[model samples]
Target: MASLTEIEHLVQSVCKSYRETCQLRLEDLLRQRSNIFSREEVTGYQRKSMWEMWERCAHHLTEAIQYVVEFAKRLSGFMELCQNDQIVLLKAGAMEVVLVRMCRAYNADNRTVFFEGKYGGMELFRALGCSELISSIFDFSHSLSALHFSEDEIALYTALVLINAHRPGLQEKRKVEQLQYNLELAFHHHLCKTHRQSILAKLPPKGKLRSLCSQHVERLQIFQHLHPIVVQAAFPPLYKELFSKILHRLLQE
Candidate 1:
């Protein structure tokens, strides 16, 4: 017998150490809607406005990204700080964090996302229009999952992306740095204790994640330019609020 409590007890020993000493968990990392499977088939994009398909896809993506709020709020001492910094950090970092969360959702073996509930593969985004743009995201999620970080590793990077102290608009940058440092301290300590390396070796340290986020920002402008009236008509408030700074900045250029 596997002895349920034995494994439970062993994992609890590890879990208790995380909270008391380090305060992180794989359960938190794997906690979102990442595991739910869908059976519905994705169909052709046909001749409909790509922007229409884009917004339709955008609605679910924005919905998936919204879980970032709950995820961020639960991070250790994350809610203890200036709420202003929390807002600013999430705004700047949410997209990258969303992209980070995607590695979990990616079905690396099949090379597909579980969009619309099934593993539609690349066909999932065929309706959204454009090949290279979709290809970039697929490659990103593909390579990121290829890195093979465990659930614990996922949580740390999520925090790293979300708690970026270097972000432009943090109100109390030092306090932000303080939290970032402690987390890094534990992270580095884990590496030392675990005797591991080669993670940052693969992904660009700048990183490629940022520019992928930029690519989304690039398309944001494109969508607005082509369908300013159309998209604005249906832009959800949360999507609008999360990206208002970028949207407003676009007003200038």
Candidate 2:
């Protein structure tokens, strides 16, 4: 039998692979859906056609959904859940995961967000009626960036976000709950073992992370309603395959 430490290493290795695969997928998608707005297009006085702008927005939304799907496939724990539970988890967690991942592209000092290498100012979001929510996202990103979690820690935390057992209609409630517990323990163990001295001080409380994610989810709910064009741009067929019920709920809400 593998020792506990060896087992932990194995899990980490798998998690790392999952994280890398998802990132690579994102990069590929980004390249495939190259920026719709060129430097001259954005900077010049000439306005692009509404259809062109809408298409670009749709591209961005598609990338977000694809990221979630790619990430979900790599999560072994998430895959183990029943089909219903898996759908619930992915649907509930998609926006949250995208929000967190976007943090890597945030520039706190300037309060700008770079999505797929195209930087957009807060003004753009304001025009989309997401000013308040965008501000909250920036705040959340700022605080999360301060924590400076390693890629491994982020991968585990993301897994935790995806396996939220409390999500409604989870068929295997106990199993999902236990999986979240295991992820939490793994997260803490990784932190403690790697940064023994700072473990107690630096490790964020579980509640804090959940609260942050919840806030983003709330924002996503409102933002989705305000910007149906962008929301509708997300590939519904793929989303339906992943979690049609949740996607319907999101649209209805």
Candidate 3:
């Protein structure tokens, strides 16, 4: 029989995987529907496509938000315990503060951008005379907008940080890899699915910042431990090698 700690760990691990799988499935559906926009192309699509695209984007965005919120809630207790242990072991309250700050930061940003807008209110481009939906059947495409994080990367990263902090040294490798795979997949799908000109323009700088913060907060050791596993799990051989090389430099101390 598993001890209480072991059971908690297993539950957290499985829940994370379940959340990732759910988010990825939704993203794949968004991809298949053929409404996603690249940053460069957001400017010129037909007004109807633009409006419909934003609506779809917002829908998927809502689903993603729910998944993330549930994951955070599930892991909160584990995070608190790990945080307390870290402070006790290292006597470095700064580390704890940084982790807590990352959590609070993500929570605030994610709620604002994702949850503030109404279910369909983001289809404002139509009101602005951007797109025309000839029929309501086409309206289902509007749900794809739910993929963008706006700022939820902070929360995702914070979740990973907390997970790693508490995880035992030996088990840390696999856990980090799983989280990284899920995070990267979620990010890629969002990037591929977003269609709004304003939103696309806003993504690059914010994405870079979030990625940088995750790198800094987690440090080189965890990255080294996780990167190989992620590469093997998620990347093709050719790209994996190149990505691993770049990853090494990014996480280098």
> Which candidate comes out best when scored by lDDT?
1
Clashes of 2: 0
lDDT, candidate 2, residue 139?
Answer: 74
User: lDDT (CA) for every model shown?
Assistant: 0.63, 0.59, 0.34
Report the lDDT tens digits of candidate 1 across residue range 166-197: 88888888888877776665554554555645
Identify the candidate with maximal TM-score. 1
Worst 10 residues of 1 by lDDT: 17-26
Tell me the deviation in Å of residue 38 in model 1.
13
The C-alpha stretches of model 2 lying farther than 4 A from their native spots are 1-3, 24-58, 196-253
Clashes of 1: 2
The runs of at least 3 residues in candidate 1 whose Cα sits more than 4 Å from the true structure, single-residue gaps closed, are 1-48, 244-253
Model 3 Cα lDDT, one tens digit per residue, 1-253: 3344553454345446445533334333333333334433323333444334433433443344334334443543333333334222122122222322222211121121111221112232332232332112122212212334433443343344434433333234444445445544443343354442344443333233334334433432343354545435543332323222322222221
RMSD for each model, in Å, please? 8.7, 6.2, 18.8
Ten-residue region with minimum lDDT total, candidate 2: 243-252
